[PDB]
Amino acid sequence: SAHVVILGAGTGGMPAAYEMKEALGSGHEVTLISANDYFQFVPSNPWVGVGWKERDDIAFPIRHYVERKGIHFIAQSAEQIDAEAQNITLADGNTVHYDYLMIATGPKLAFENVPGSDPHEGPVQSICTVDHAERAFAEYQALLREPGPIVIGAMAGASCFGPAYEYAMIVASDLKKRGMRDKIPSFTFITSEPYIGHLGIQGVGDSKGILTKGLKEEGIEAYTNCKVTKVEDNKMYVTQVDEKGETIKEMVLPVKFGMMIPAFKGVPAVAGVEGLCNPGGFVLVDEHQRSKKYANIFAAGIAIAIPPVETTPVPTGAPKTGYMIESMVSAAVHNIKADLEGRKGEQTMGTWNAVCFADMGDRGAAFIALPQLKPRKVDVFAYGRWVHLAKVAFEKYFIRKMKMGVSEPFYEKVLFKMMGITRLKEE
Amino acid sequence: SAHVVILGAGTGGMPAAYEMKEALGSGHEVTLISANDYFQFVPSNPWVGVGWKERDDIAFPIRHYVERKGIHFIAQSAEQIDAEAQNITLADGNTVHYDYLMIATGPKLAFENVPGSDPHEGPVQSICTVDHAERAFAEYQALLREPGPIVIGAMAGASCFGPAYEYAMIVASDLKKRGMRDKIPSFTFITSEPYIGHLGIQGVGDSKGILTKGLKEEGIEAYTNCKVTKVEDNKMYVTQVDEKGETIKEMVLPVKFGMMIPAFKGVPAVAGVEGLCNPGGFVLVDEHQRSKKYANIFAAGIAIAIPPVETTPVPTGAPKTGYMIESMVSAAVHNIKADLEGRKGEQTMGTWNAVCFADMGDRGAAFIALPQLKPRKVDVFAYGRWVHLAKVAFEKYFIRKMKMGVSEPFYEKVLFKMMGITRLKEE
Ligand SMILES: Cc1cc2nc3c(=O)[nH]c(=O)nc-3n(C[C@H](O)[C@H](O)[C@H](O)COP(=O)(O)OP(=O)(O)OC[C@H]3O[C@@H](n4cnc5c(N)ncnc54)[C@H](O)[C@@H]3O)c2cc1C
Ligand SMILES: Cc1cc2nc3c(=O)[nH]c(=O)nc-3n(C[C@H](O)[C@H](O)[C@H](O)COP(=O)(O)OP(=O)(O)OC[C@H]3O[C@@H](n4cnc5c(N)ncnc54)[C@H](O)[C@@H]3O)c2cc1C
Ligand SMILES: [S]
Ligand SMILES: [S]
Ligand SMILES: [S]
Ligand SMILES: [S]
Ligand SMILES: [S]
Ligand SMILES: [S]
Question: How far is residue A316's CA from residue A312's CA, in Å, rounded to a whole number?
Answer without folding.
Answer: 6
